[PDB]
Amino acid sequence: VSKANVPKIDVSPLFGDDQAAKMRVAQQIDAASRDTGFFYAVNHGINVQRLSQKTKEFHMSITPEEKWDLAIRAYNKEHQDQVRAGYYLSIPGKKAVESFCYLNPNFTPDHPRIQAKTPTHEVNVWPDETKHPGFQDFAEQYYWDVFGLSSALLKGYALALGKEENFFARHFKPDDTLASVVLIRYPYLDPYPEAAIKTAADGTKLSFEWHEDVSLITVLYQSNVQNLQVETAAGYQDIEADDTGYLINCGSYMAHLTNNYYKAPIHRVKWVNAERQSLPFFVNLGYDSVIDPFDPREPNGKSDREPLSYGDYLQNGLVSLINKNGQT
Ligand SMILES: CC(C)[C@@H](OC(=O)[C@H](CS)NC(=O)CCC[C@H](N)C(=O)O)C(=O)O
Numbered sequence: 428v429s430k431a432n433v434p435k436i437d438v439s440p441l442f443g444d445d446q447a448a449k450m451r452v453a454q455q456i457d458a459a460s461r462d463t464g465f466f467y468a469v470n471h472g473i474n475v476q477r478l479s480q481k482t483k484e485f486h487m488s489i490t491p492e493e494k495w496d497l498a499i500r501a502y503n504k505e506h507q508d509q510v511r512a513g514y515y516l517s518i519p520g521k522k523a524v525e526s527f528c529y530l531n532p533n534f535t536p537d538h539p540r541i542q543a544k545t546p547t548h549e550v551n552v553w554p555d556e557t558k559h560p561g562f563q564d565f566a567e568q569y570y571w572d573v574f575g576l577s578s579a580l581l582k583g584y585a586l587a588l589g590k591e592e593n594f595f596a597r598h599f600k601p602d603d604t605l606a607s608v609v610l611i612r613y614p615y616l617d618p619y620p621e622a623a624i625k626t627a628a629d630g631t632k633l634s635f636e637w638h639e640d641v642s643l644i645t646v647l648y649q650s651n652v653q654n655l656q657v658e659t660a661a662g663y664q665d666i667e668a669d670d671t672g673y674l675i676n677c678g679s680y681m682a683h684l685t686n687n688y689y690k691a692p693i694h695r696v697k698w699v700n701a702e703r704q705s706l707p708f709f710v711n712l713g714y715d716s717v718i719d720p721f722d723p724r725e726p727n728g729k730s731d732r733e734p735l736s737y738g739d740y741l742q743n744g745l746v747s748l749i750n751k752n753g754q755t
């Protein structure tokens with residue numbers, strides 16, 4: 428299997444005020460988005476070793492009792508409000524992966540969207556503080572650290588498409604973003620049950636099948652164990668691991684807005700028998716955010732696609748992904 432072209436881009440100028448330097452970064456983002464659709468953001472400023480250590484401390488100490496008590500509705504019928512946020516249990520002998528998802532920390536009981544019971548907005552659930560000291564505070568601060576990197580990346584994507592730097596970022600706000608963090612644990616298992624291993628049409632053993640992301644962009648930290656593959660014209664190629672950077676790609680909302688100039692790359696997760704972490708941040712806008720679709724390949728920039736509100740896109744996208752590739 429050939430290695431996919433995944434450039435490392437120094438995104439540090441996107442946090443500053445050197446406009447020329449920002450345009451040179453935007454060009455790199457444009458090139459990577461038009462090629463394989465993936466790049467590693469380096470010089471991003473986030474302490475990813477600490478993220479990995481705090482996540483490991485949580486995954487390895489949470490107990491079965493706590494998992495039921497934090498479980499989403501798919502695993503625990505008592506928790507009807509938990510569609511997105513909470514614990515996603517493994518099923519020994521059948522399903523290896525397990526994870527913990529949380530949303531905007533500003534979705535509190537008094538938030539207007541929580542009061543209106545608007546779909547896709549939920550109040551986060553957390554384990555007991557005495558059992559996981561400092562975890563909630565760490566995780567909430569991580570959300571804001573990765574939100575800040577994502578705002579900087581969105582300035583780069585906007586400039587890359589010929590827009591002003593706040594084109595996307597003006598719709599990505601702390602008070603209403605639907606962005607989520609998922610702390611995924613992929614375990615080492617001896618024996619590794621065959622029921623938890625899927626097989627692609629090309630014979631590749633997988634943990635998660637081909638898909639496009641449900642996001643504007645996806646900002647991912649993963650352990651140093653190679654696992655992702657991206658479909659290109661030359662076939663599926665391996666994305667090398669880099670546990671010092673963030674792997675960035677576009678989701679189908681970006682493909683919609685750009686009339687597929689920046690496609691949402693199709694990718695999948697190979698089966699690897701290794702204890703590792705996959706920690707995505709899905710950059711989602713607000714429920715009512717609507718960006719008018721355009722086409723940077725057309726002289727007048729017009730598109731034959733209709734505006735789609737982010738909330739509608741997200742609710743239906745998450746359900747469709749579960750229908751296609753299974754409840755995680
Ligand atoms: C490919 C990486 C990102 C990861 O997959 C994933 O995270 C997969 C495919 S992108 N994503 C999802 O299942 C969507 C989770 C959405 C989250 N519950 C939310 O409510 O916002 C993996 O399996 O390692």
Ligand SMILES: [Fe+2]
Nearest residue numbers: 638639640694
């Ligand atoms: Fe994905």
